[PDB]
């Protein structure tokens, strides 16, 4: 149904662009993080003009059909819900686990194995914390 | 009589139907299955078994001819035998009359998945033979064979009991000669972009 | 003055089979990573803008809504298999539709279709007697309603 | 004429070793591997496996030309 | 009430059969053991039939991360010689007895797809022309 | 700089003759001929044909799928109103009248290739018509006593309902001929009044 204007990616290209995909998204708010982070101009749908360096207002007011960078609204509107400071800090931290598992799946890692593999080490840190 | 609520494949629905007096002449076949698709050609495999009820009346209903590639074979030897019978030029006409009859059996072995090269050769045997007599004997049902299973070549299509009614036969050759008629007979069309 | 097809024409004969196994491979491609616990989920964006997220292969095949008839009969085996059952609906597809793919050399060699249908369908019959040998059901085995639970 | 004929079974008997031709070498070896194929494994069964298939290309073709069907053929002859 | 579990939904269909590749196997090898009597065009057809039935464990071990290639011909080995009873485990990639681990899987899932996948499948060779007609 | 010559009408698409005209007519019907070949048979395969409701219709006669494909061919519609002839004014042979009046016009090529008028190619199947009708008559072995008896209803259905849905036929003889004793009146000694209707059946399906 709709074969015209339809893309789908299974197994070969998908693996490739939703690491790339999520790493520009995220690339956004790098240089936002921190309180010395810098801001940027949002202009509304309406017309109105503001600036703010908080991640959670600069993802809520991206409406994008990017596939894989709806994940990461998905997560932030939890994020404001149950902490709210981790908004900018995850992103960043969601995109670098995702930036070292290209680097693994060029090695022939299978992806859940990667997914297992970020549980442990996540289950190991916090008894070092 | 009777009117109830039964169950059928699931769901309760109100069915309405008798037993002896006041006798009806309308009957419903009641079907039961998983696919959809598979229980249209039901019904219309029953409307094409009920039309062929229609047939069983006085216009020769109980006459009936064996099927699935025997009489079209035997038709063969009989056509091809007044090509030589009746002198002129029409004897190239009536000996391709025969030859558009092998389209029928080698059909049937196309969409059996047989070889076309052993149903035609085994048939032409079958149906021509030398009997020591005036009367011709022994096995005239030879058919094409579904196949599929059990041993070799063709067998009688009366052990499957399976027959091609006269009324359907007959009727069938005469709109297939007014059908090729037309077309042969037009030379000249003019149409328009549609 | 009336044209239901509006003049598209479709090719015919043994290369449309191929084309229909293509169509197989597909949606069973799709449905390849999604087969078990464990299996991949598929994100299906749908031109109503909702955006949803599911593990089970029936309302994925549910909301892509297949026009192509050959991929359409692989969706309506998988509704049939959730109703009725609930259990096999992603695995149905698949075991179909690599079913498809041997039948793909087959064609090639000049094996008539027919033959290659009669050919899984006597498997199949061997297959489930098989099945009933293989399946454990115990009465005086000495188990019971509870020891054998 | 008698000495062509004579060469066909002379050199035959030449070589004091010999083995059924017309596909039987092939067909036996098909069925040897199949059975050895999994006396070993370690990802070579895959490899072990079609090269055993790999020999019935040989009477297959033979069967072609010899307008026979080459999937009753071979398959019989795997069989027998 | 994790044992209760287990036991409902064991109680409810009463015709069980071994999971873990362990009935998909043997349907395979069964089949391939039979084609012999089978000989002809119709054993190279139930050959491709028993090979197309592995691609149900193929691709439950790629998603697990579990090698399709080892343990495919692990399991047919250790399932061809011995016991039977030998399927692949789900947690840590060995070979072992999924009916001495008590995982299983009931019958009704199993023949209701095999015989609506080769259903589906007879209806899709069959059709050598496809007219959609717009509207 | 090239004239055009040969059409004295109107703007159209034409066709003489002089082009082969007779081979195209038949290659337009040949076109539709091969989906039927397939479908006569117990082997016989269905096609798949989308209404223009957006609904996949799957059928093996030929009868129903002439009425859902768009034909612009009129030499096809000779074929078409003649299978209706086949569906209205009998039960069966839709799938035959295809066949048979498909492999006329391929047989009738070898006739013009020779250089024979098509009227004695009509001439001679006129003749060839009265020689296997005289035939057919003589082709009758048994005739049907036309008992209405249960079992003799499982001889003529059975293979009417063949040729769709293989392997079925034993069970949908013992459906259709309990409904067929139920319609026809107990009469005896009577053949003047018909009895026995089409649409006295109804048939029914729930999944």
Redesign the interface.
Known sequence: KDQGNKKRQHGLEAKKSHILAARSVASIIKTSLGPRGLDKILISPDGEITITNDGATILSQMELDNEIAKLLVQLSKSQDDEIGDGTTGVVVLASALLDQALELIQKGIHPIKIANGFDEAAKLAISKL | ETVKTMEIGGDRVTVFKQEQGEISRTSTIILRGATQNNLDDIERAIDDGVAAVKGLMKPSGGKLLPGAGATEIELISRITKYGERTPGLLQLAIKQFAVAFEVVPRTLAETAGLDVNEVLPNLYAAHNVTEPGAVKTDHLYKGVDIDGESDEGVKDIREENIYDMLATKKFAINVATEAATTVLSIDQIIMAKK | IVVLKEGTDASQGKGQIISNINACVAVQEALKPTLGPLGSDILIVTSNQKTTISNDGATILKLLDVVHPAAKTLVDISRAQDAEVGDGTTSVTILAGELMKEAKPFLEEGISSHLIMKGYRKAVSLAVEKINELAVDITSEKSSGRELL | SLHDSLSVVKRTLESGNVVPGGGCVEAALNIYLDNFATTVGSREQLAIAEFAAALLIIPKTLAVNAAKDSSELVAKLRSY | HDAIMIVKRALQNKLIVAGGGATEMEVSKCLRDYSKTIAGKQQMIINAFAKALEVIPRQLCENAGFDAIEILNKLRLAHSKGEKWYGVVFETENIGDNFAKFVWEPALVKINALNSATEATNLILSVDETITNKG | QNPNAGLF?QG??????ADG??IK??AA?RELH??C??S???????????????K??????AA?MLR???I?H??VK??VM?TE??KI?????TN??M??????????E??IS?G?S?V??????????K???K??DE????????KNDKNE?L????????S???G?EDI?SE??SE??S??L?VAQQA?EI?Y???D????????
């Open positions: 009408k159209y698409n034409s066709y003489s003759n005209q007779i007519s038949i019907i091969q989906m070949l397939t006569m048979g117990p082997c016989g395969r269905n096609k798949i044909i989308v209404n223009h409701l957006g996949i219709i799957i059928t093996n006669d129903t859902e494909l768009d612009v009129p030499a000779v074929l003649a002839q086949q004014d009998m039960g069966d042979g035959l009248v066949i048979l009046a498909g492999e006329l016009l391929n047989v009738s070898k006739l020779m024979l098509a004695e190619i009509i001439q001679g199947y006129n003749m060839a018509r020689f296997t009708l035939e057919l082709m009758v072995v048994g005739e049907i006593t036309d209803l001889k003529m259905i059975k293979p009417v309902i063949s769709k849905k293989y079925s949908l459906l259709v409904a067929v139920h319609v009146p053949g018909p026995f209707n089409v006295s059946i109804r048939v029914v399906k729930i999944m």
